[PDB]
Design a protein around this motif. Structure first.
Motif, PDB file in Angstrom:
ATOM      1  N   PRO C  70       0.798  -1.232   0.000  1.00 48.50           N
ATOM      2  CA  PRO C  70       0.000   0.000   0.000  1.00 48.50           C
ATOM      3  C   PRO C  70       0.820   1.267   0.000  1.00 48.50           C
ATOM      4  O   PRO C  70       0.235   2.349   0.092  1.00 48.50           O
ATOM      5  CB  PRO C  70      -0.818  -0.111   1.290  1.00 48.50           C
ATOM      6  CG  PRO C  70      -0.696  -1.527   1.710  1.00 48.50           C
ATOM      7  CD  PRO C  70       0.650  -1.961   1.261  1.00 48.50           C
ATOM      8  N   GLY C  71       2.144   1.182  -0.078  1.00 53.99           N
ATOM      9  CA  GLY C  71       2.946   2.390  -0.015  1.00 53.99           C
ATOM     10  C   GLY C  71       2.918   3.186  -1.304  1.00 53.99           C
ATOM     11  O   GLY C  71       3.061   4.410  -1.289  1.00 53.99           O
ATOM     12  N   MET C  73       0.435   3.526  -3.594  1.00 55.10           N
ATOM     13  CA  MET C  73      -0.819   4.237  -3.835  1.00 55.10           C
ATOM     14  C   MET C  73      -0.864   5.578  -3.119  1.00 55.10           C
ATOM     15  O   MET C  73      -1.458   6.536  -3.623  1.00 55.10           O
ATOM     16  CB  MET C  73      -1.995   3.381  -3.393  1.00 55.10           C
ATOM     17  CG  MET C  73      -2.226   2.108  -4.163  1.00 55.10           C
ATOM     18  SD  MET C  73      -2.606   2.293  -5.905  1.00 55.10           S
ATOM     19  CE  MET C  73      -1.048   1.872  -6.643  1.00 55.10           C
ATOM     20  N   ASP C  74      -0.249   5.668  -1.941  1.00 56.36           N
ATOM     21  CA  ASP C  74      -0.145   6.964  -1.284  1.00 56.36           C
ATOM     22  C   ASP C  74       0.837   7.866  -2.015  1.00 56.36           C
ATOM     23  O   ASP C  74       0.671   9.091  -2.031  1.00 56.36           O
ATOM     24  CB  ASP C  74       0.269   6.790   0.172  1.00 56.36           C
ATOM     25  CG  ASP C  74       0.322   8.103   0.914  1.00 56.36           C
ATOM     26  OD1 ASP C  74      -0.753   8.668   1.200  1.00 56.36           O
ATOM     27  OD2 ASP C  74       1.439   8.577   1.208  1.00 56.36           O
TER      28      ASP C  74
END
Ligand SMILES: Nc1nc2c(ncn2[C@@H]2O[C@H](COP(=O)(O)OP(=O)(O)OP(=O)(O)O)[C@@H](O)[C@H]2O)c(=O)[nH]1
Ligand SMILES: Nc1nc2c(ncn2[C@@H]2O[C@H](COP(=O)(O)OP(=O)(O)OP(=O)(O)O)[C@@H](O)[C@H]2O)c(=O)[nH]1
Ligand SMILES: Nc1nc2c(ncn2[C@@H]2O[C@H](COP(=O)(O)OP(=O)(O)O)[C@@H](O)[C@H]2O)c(=O)[nH]1
Ligand SMILES: Nc1nc2c(ncn2[C@@H]2O[C@H](COP(=O)(O)OP(=O)(O)O)[C@@H](O)[C@H]2O)c(=O)[nH]1
Ligand SMILES: [Mg+2]
Ligand SMILES: [Mg+2]
Lengths: 115, 439, 428, 51, 429, 428
Positions: C70-71, C73-74
């Motif tokens: 998920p890193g 997408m931020d």
């Protein structure tokens, strides 16, 4: 006591690392005694303006939490889609089937169903 | 979210954890009593402390760590020292009477009364937080509770968690520098669990750190505080890609599959390259291509074994700071140009590269310098096979005359466990042979 | 009415594709908030090939961005043009692939592939007529090469007559940055030769020699190597969006190019790439643009194509130019050089022109070459896989979750023939 | 074509400005940090004598 | 591209790498702080505008390191190049090579392996030591032995002080100064000899300074080594290098022996007269009655003549003065070289040094001739090694750690063959 | 229309080559940025021969500068005119030349021969036609000899029809600039005879001759020595470049001079030269111009013309001038002495008269002269080389380069027949 004055900085560093005077929890430079144990040397001095990090690149996760709250997307809809048309007209509408659906040009000689 | 749990065992491992939690606290803004010191000042973009801290209801951050000791005196310096207002008071687990340089005490008769406490306190910590990349434990070979309870912790922690990764950090005895006569008897016999039940078991000798300080730095007579500060900058470089983002980042899963060829060859080395006295950092350059040529120097390794005798199986490179990706790829092909740097016949690729944007931080009062660039070179090497060749010879020389055995055998240990450990390490001296010759 | 969908895969594709939407939106004239503020008038006439409509006259790009961590997408959402993507269109897992192709094909990524296709069926419903999907991934890692392949073999089966297009970062020969590369790359060509209509070879070593010898940069970071690929993906499909003389769509470049249906691994290149000292010194003419297309430096794949014959050659010119200077200058290549061309095709060149140049240039092209030198990196990848697999170097990280070992010697069966198929068509 | 020419020269000017800025400020900050080292060293010597 | 990375071995080597680097560091604007691209030949760069001269201060005696470091130039020569041994070698090839010489190779490997990365294209190695001292004859020998195995064809030239036949400083010095050149004929490319009696001769009669110290003799070697390697650094009328005369001054891999001579040795009482013309300065080179090795050339072979020039140089008077050399026959004619010259011209005139010894100089020329005169004056040291190897003197300190007595006659036959081939080269071709 | 590509190499080739395109651009009238500064329109006809029309009114050198040592690149870019030079045309090596042909021709010529040849094949392909070609290089130095004469042979395979040519510098045969230059120069001209089509050679002894006794100008530098060549070597290509009354090519003068295509050795020199003190005493007539090329007071190269007979002569001119006293001056030098001219062949001259003089001079000229005097400089070389090949000293450098001692004896018999070829053409 102001690290943007002493050092240049990347302008997005937070105020904690900007102002070093607020770290009030460290030891207070007691003059030495003989009964001075050695494991107490860990963390014996507060950070000063020289030791603050110049840049900071932390990993925000606010967007990832606020998107992945609940579940990811999944199709639970009924099968809704229009089969589209090959010709480009807003009036001419033919598909792979139903090739005879168009506005007939006004033939003068006979009605248009007679070829 | 992307967290880790740091489990500290024994007198050596606690005094690593006095150095780590000093240094993670400096890397974030956290004061020694929790208290993220922002006072009515707005900020946005944060949560780089989920990997090692937990934000609680009062706004006070409490780390994920259990401190285990069988000695009361070592941990009670933390309970009265400066960091007393940081750890939760259930997480400084204290023994009652120590193992006293004994595997059999630390694994059969004294850790039985305490193992029910620690496995309740770990399960409290992990149920609390979402994911788990993996535990990062710290121990020492040459002592009782450092290698007894550690051998009992790892047999029990690999059953009930399993697929979550583990790491392992060791203090390994020297050829010359020893502190106990029990040192070979328990550095041979601790390998019945650090082979089966460890996914990566890093290796650190006391002797090279005693020598790397006198030669790179202008320091003589270095004590144990200066050994803890250096290994605090390794653990804060392996895990730096979890917190602070980069162009090429490796998680704990990523370098696990790039570094161990077969599941009984998980004994890598580690080096930290830009170690330099803070006067000498004014002098030289410490470029992007200077500090990667220093990783393979025999003077700057971590275990006193000659690297010019084995063959390198794999290498993982963990760069930190302002690194460009063209300068990395100029460096690696220069190493494969030189033909005194030896790679195994079935590995032409060779390397794994990681880059983080966060510069390596400084510690106040630390003899390490402030440098824009850093690298930590992980490697699996055949030269560590010649490092047990000075410990099997110190074990059978002991064992033939049966010196110092009657303490172990009177505590629930049978004599069939001594010689069983000797064949299980003389087997591994062929596993590091049979993958050495060419095809 | 002919529109496409731009899938992005892995972490290398999210550096490519996030730079792809800052180049198209520069061209079509969209602010980062998503509202049109542009100069000309036909610029949004064909906005619907890529973009979409919303309430209040704001345009959203269509895509789907996948990852297993998920890193990223931020990082995309905090980009410069990261505001315009819909937040529903990001899909991501929770545990990374860990450079394991088998994790990203069986155990870590297959939970996610049933959720990407629900986004894809929602975007493909909105069409007038799909021209074909589009994907961007990397043949070196785990989550680009495993799950980014598992998207392909499931999209192709349920949309069988659309023009699938990919863009591949082929691993380097020796200047490499992953230990377990050849297990990752040979296990992906096994499923990429039979499911893609075109596939592009992007060396990361020919993408440095461009940035040293013809652009003369000083610190070539990743911020501009994503841009060099992202000018070719815009350059191929300019004929789709904008008018001109001799247009050639995304499909009519495929028909003329691939002579036999297993030989679709191309090598691209972009024609005016000029150092900033020599911007004053390049002469804007059509023949000077052509000598850059066929120069051996501006090849952007890993093998020099002077070691064999080109099979078919494209040239998609852009701008205002007489189409006599187009069709004469390609002829002068086929006569000065004759041994370097296949002689059972009597004309090896497809051309195309459109009237809307890139922003900040008078004219530009996009070379596409189906050279027979592309067997060479297929041998060097296969030789670094038959040395690992002599004595099973890293195999237990892949085998332990359900992949048996015979799907590794099946791969070289479907790989060592494709080395040979270029050799029998090399001559006679 | 001429407006492309001025855009090229503008990028040259920006590049040389940024290079000289980085050289100047980072050498000044190094001098500041080394004066801090000298001060802390002399303070610790006085501590030794006092003990 | 122009960088001569060096390495110092010795008390002699580090005293020379003090007082020649005087003029090296006044030729550029580095004041002794180390602060402010001709400098990049020597000086590295940090990030923060600071330098390191790419050199290593190896020596086993622990006095010369502290005495060099306690000068003005403290933090100029930075302290991690400073490689110090615990006990000195003290006229012992065995101590300096075997029992103490093997101890610091692990240091010298770091400090010469890391320096290769910091230049664009490395040119070669000039090295500094001496022959009458054991640790300057031993680590230099073992340095060449390891380094020419590892690297090979890089440029390797030596600086040293050779015992002139009148006066010397140690007793059995023809031993240790003749054993250590069994590797200088193998692992290196060229060799410089400068005896201090040939400087004591000139420092009275060409500068009017009676009683000169070795630190005054440490500056005419600086006025050589300026114009020799300074042609690399500044674009002259013809930009000549040192790999140039590495090729050019070597006809055989045995006879690499050039002779160094620099023109302006004039006083401030004499500077009222010299016009600094090319004729008078090239006379001050090629009249060897006042040059820097004490051998009169009038029985030698006049083979290869490199002439470097710095300053206010005109090629018409250069090509008139070298033609003027070719006129007179008192410098005679070798057969197989018809012309055998080299012109090098550089446009930075040399820097007058405060605390120096002479007055204002405009014009500079230095010559390196290959001549067999000192090759036949090698026979004095070769013959008087025998007078002390007739009676088995001093061998006991040598022999304990590895100078066994076979090598002592191995070097003797090896170096009698050198004179036997000098005689055939001096037989006319 | 006719175009010219330029190849240029090394240090001495660059110093002559930086001055050449400085004084090329005087008569073309080109800005030190590069834009138009023409003072008349007849001066802007065939500027396209040397320059490509870069946009903006701009013009660039169609010239490739190579060097294996970047330490003499800064002598070129920091020149008075060195902002015309294109940076792509610069290509620079990292390994030093070593003042050696064999290092520069075999060892270090090997890596960069493909890099130069692909760039030269890039620039020469865009020509509608290549009329003439040149190279500025030296023989006394290494990579000017090594990389200089290697690359003539490599284009010689690919381009055999178009005319190549050589502007070379013999090292000084009176005072040496390398000791053993019979190893450098003779081993490089051994390649050069079959590499090229014609050879121009000026020596520095004829250059220092003029400024000493004839020009009355003391202290000449290499910027004065480069002023008797860089207008001379633009002084033969005049009538192709600037339109004239009797216009001639570069190839056609090379066609009309000879009936037998075996040998080619010239000597250039500029005609209108007299002292600046004698600037107003001695500007009288066009017979004053012709009394300079004929007399040996003008020494073109180091060889003295009075030694032997001339098989032909050639005298080009720029500017409007007469016709009947052109006919007179080729007759009056015949009648008084006929020892210079051969007594068999009566007609020798090629008088090409242009209309456009340079600025500042009204009656310009250039002399190219074929006789048997080139023999003399090689004959003392055949007294130099045989003194040093009978002992074989510096050949210990040359064994390990990649060649044997049999190329040395064979190449000298490739020259010692030519000395015999000249001496029997001179007889009978
Ligand atoms: N590197 C490093 N090693 C340490 C440090 N402190 C202790 N050690 C090692 O720890 C070993 C002693 O083993 P321990 O883990 O302390 O075992 P123990 O705590 O003494 O066992 P008990 O006395 O029964 O509690 C010594 O051999 C040291 O090598 C330290 O600060 N740094
Ligand atoms: N001309 C000159 N000669 C020097 C200098 N320093 C030392 N020497 C010469 O060196 C000789 C003896 O000194 P070294 O060669 O250094 O002998 P050493 O002191 O034993 O050398 P180490 O033991 O290695 O330090 C004497 O003949 C001196 O003439 C110098 O700075 N200039
Ligand atoms: N062209 C290009 N390649 C990149 C970029 N970032 C990473 N890579 C390449 O991606 C490869 C590894 O990709 P990886 O991160 O493992 O992709 P993933 O498996 O999808 O996460 C390396 O060979 C890099 O060269 C980029 O911005 N541009
Ligand atoms: N006329 C002229 N001769 C030159 C120039 N530069 C060098 N030379 C000559 O070149 C010959 C050898 O020079 P050198 O530097 O060794 O050749 P290089 O190494 O190939 O550049 C000498 O005879 C010089 O006179 C120049 O600019 N003009
Ligand atoms: Mg313990
Ligand atoms: Mg000494």
């Amino acid at each position: 006591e102001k690290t943007s004055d002493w050092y240049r900085v990347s302008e997005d560093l937070p105020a904690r690392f900007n102002n070093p005077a607020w770290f009030r929890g460290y030891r207070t430079k007691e003059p030495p005694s003989v009964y001075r144990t050695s494991n107490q040397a860990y963390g014996s001095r507060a950070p000063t303006v020289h030791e603050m990090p110049k840049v900071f690149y932390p990993n925000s996760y606010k967007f990832s939490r606020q998107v992945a709250v609940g579940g990811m997307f999944q199709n639970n809809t009924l099968n809704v889609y229009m089969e589209k048309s090959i010709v480009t007209g807003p009036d001419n509408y033919i598909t792979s089937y139903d090739r005879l659906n168009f506005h007939p040009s006004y033939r003068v000689c006979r009605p248009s169903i007679c070829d | 979210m992307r967290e880790c749990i740091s489990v500290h065992v024994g007198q050596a491992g606690v005094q690593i954890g006095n150095a780590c939690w000093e240094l993670y606290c400096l890397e974030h803004g956290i004061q020694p009593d929790g208290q993220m010191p922002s006072d009515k000042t707005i900020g946005g973009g944060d949560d780089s402390f989920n990997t090692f801290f937990s934000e609680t209801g009062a706004g006070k951050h409490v780390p994920r760590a259990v401190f285990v000791d069988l000695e009361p005196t070592v941990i009670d310096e933390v309970r009265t020292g400066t960091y007393r207002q940081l750890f939760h008071p259930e997480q400084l687990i204290t023994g009652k009477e120590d193992a006293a340089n004994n595997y059999a005490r630390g694994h059969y008769t004294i850790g039985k009364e305490l193992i029910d406490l620690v496995l309740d306190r770990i399960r409290k910590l992990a149920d609390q937080c979402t994911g788990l990349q993996g535990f990062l434990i710290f121990h020492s070979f040459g002592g009782g509770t450092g290698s007894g309870f550690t051998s009992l912790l790892m047999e029990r922690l690999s059953v009930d968690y399993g697929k979550k990764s583990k790491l392992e950090f060791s203090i390994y005895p020297a050829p010359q520098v020893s502190t106990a006569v029990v040192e070979p008897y328990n550095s041979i016999l601790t390998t019945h669990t650090t082979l089966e039940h460890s996914d990566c078991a890093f290796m650190v000798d006391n002797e090279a750190i005693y020598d790397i300080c006198r030669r790179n730095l202008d320091i003589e007579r270095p004590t144990y505080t200066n050994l803890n500060r250096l290994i605090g900058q390794i653990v804060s470089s392996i895990t730096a890609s979890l917190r602070f983002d980069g162009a090429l980042n490796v998680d704990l899963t990523e370098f696990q599959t790039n570094l161990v060829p077969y599941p009984r060859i998980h004994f890598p080395l580690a080096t930290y390259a830009p170690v330099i006295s803070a006067e000498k950092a004014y002098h030289e350059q410490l470029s992007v291509a200077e500090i990667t040529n220093a990783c393979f120097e025999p003077a700057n390794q971590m275990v006193k074994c000659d690297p010019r005798h084995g063959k390198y199986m794999a290498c993982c490179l963990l760069y930190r700071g302002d690194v460009v990706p063209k300068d990395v790829n100029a460096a690696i092909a220069t190493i494969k140009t030189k033909r005194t740097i030896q790679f195994v016949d079935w590995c032409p690729t060779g390397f794994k590269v990681g880059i983080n944007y966060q510069p390596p931080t400084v510690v106040p009062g630390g003899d390490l310098a402030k440098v824009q660039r850093a690298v930590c070179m992980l490697s699996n090497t055949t030269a560590i096979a010649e490092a047990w060749a000075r410990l099997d010879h110190k074990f059978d020389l002991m064992y033939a005359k049966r010196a110092f055995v009657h303490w172990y055998v009177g505590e629930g240990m049978e004599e069939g466990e001594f010689s069983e450990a000797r064949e299980d390490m003389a087997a591994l001296e062929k596993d590091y042979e049979e993958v050495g010759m060419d095809s | 009415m002919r529109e496409i969908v731009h899938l992005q895969a892995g972490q290398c594709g999210n550096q490519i594709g996030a730079k792809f939407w800052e180049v198209i939106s520069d061209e079509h004239g969209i602010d980062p908030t998503g509202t049109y503020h542009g100069d000309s008038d036909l610029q949004l006439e064909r906005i619907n090939v890529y973009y979409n409509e919303a309430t209040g006259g704001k345009y959203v790009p269509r895509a789907v961005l996948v990852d297993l961590e998920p890193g990223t997408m931020d990082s995309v959402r905090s980009g410069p043009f990261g505001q315009i993507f819909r937040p529903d269109n990001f899909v991501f897992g929770q545990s990374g692939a860990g450079n394991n192709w088998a994790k990203g094909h069986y155990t870590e990524g297959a939970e996610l592939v049933d959720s990407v296709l629900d986004v894809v069926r929602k975007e493909a419903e909105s069409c007038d007529c799909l021209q074909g999907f589009q994907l961007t991934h990397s043949l070196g890692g785990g989550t680009g090469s495993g799950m980014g392949t598992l998207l392909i073999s499931k999209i192709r089966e349920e949309y069988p007559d659309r023009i699938m297009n990919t863009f591949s970062v082929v691993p380097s020969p020796k200047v490499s940055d992953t230990v377990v590369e050849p297990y990752n790359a040979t296990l992906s060509v096994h499923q990429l030769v039979e499911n893609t209509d075109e596939t592009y070879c992007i060396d990361n070593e020919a993408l440095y020699d461009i940035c040293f010898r013809t652009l003369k940069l000083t610190t070539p970071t990743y911020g501009d190597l994503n841009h060099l690929v992202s000018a070719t993906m815009s350059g191929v499909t300019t004929c789709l969006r904008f008018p001109g003389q001799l247009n050639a769509d995304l499909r009519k470049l495929a028909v003329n190019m691939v002579p036999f249906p297993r030989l679709h691994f191309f090598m691209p290149g972009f024609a005016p790439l000029t150092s900033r000292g020599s911007q004053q010194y390049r002469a804007l003419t059509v023949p000077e643009l052509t000598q850059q297309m066929f120069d051996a430096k501006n090849m952007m794949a890993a093998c020099d194509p002077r070691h064999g014959r080109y099979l078919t050659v494209a040239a998609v010119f852009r701008g205002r130019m007489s189409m006599k200077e187009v069709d004469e200058q390609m002829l002068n290549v086929q006569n000065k050089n004759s041994s370097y061309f296949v002689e059972w095709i009597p004309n090896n060149v497809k051309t195309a022109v459109c009237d809307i140049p890139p922003r900040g240039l008078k004219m530009s092209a996009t070379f596409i070459g189906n050279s027979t030198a592309i067997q060479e990196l297929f041998k060097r990848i296969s030789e670094q896989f038959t040395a690992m697999f002599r004595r099973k170097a890293f195999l237990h990280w892949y085998t332990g979750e359900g992949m048996d070992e015979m799907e590794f010697t099946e791969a070289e069966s479907n790989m060592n023939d494709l080395v040979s198929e270029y050799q029998q068509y090399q001559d006679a | 074509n001429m407006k492309l020419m001025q855009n090229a020269l503008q990028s040259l000017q920006e590049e040389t400005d940024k290079k000289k800025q980085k050289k100047e400020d980072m050498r000044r900050e190094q001098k500041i940090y080394y004066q801090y080292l000298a001060q802390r060293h002399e303070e610790e010597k006085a501590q030794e004598k006092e003990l």
